[PDB]
Amino acid sequence: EMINSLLSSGEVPGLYTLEELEPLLLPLKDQASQDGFFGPVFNYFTYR
Amino acid sequence: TDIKKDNRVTTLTTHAGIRNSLLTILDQLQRCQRSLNEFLEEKRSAFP
Numbered sequence: 001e002m003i004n005s006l007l008s009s010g011e012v013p014g015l016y017t018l019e020e021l022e023p024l025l026l027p028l029k030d031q032a033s034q035d036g037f038f039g040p041v042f043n044y045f046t047y048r
Numbered sequence: 049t050d051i052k053k054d055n056r057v058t059t060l061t062t063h064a065g066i067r068n069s070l071l072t073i074l075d076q077l078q079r080c081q082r083s084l085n086e087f088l089e090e091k092r093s094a095f096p
Contacts, residue, residue: 033075038072
């Protein structure tokens with residue numbers, strides 16, 4: 001079921017918490033700014 | 049265009065979240081400046 005989700009969507013649900021996404025996705029805002037991808041940082045992480 | 053609609057000065061306090069729109073427009077202009085560096089050096093080599 002986890003592999004089914006990670007195939008279909010791109011995320012694994014209920015895997016990370018909320019506090020463990022900003023010090024990890026924090027180095028992605030720069031390429032997020034330069035590439036043209038908008039919205040929050042987590043959609044860019046899922047797209048990568 | 050929305051400023052052309054209503055020109056009362058306190059409408060900018062009450063638009064639909066303009067703060068991130070303004071900051072992102074400023075940041076993208078900074079980035080197109082960094083893209084324009086090369087053309088600036090071309091015109092500096094053109095006129096002494």
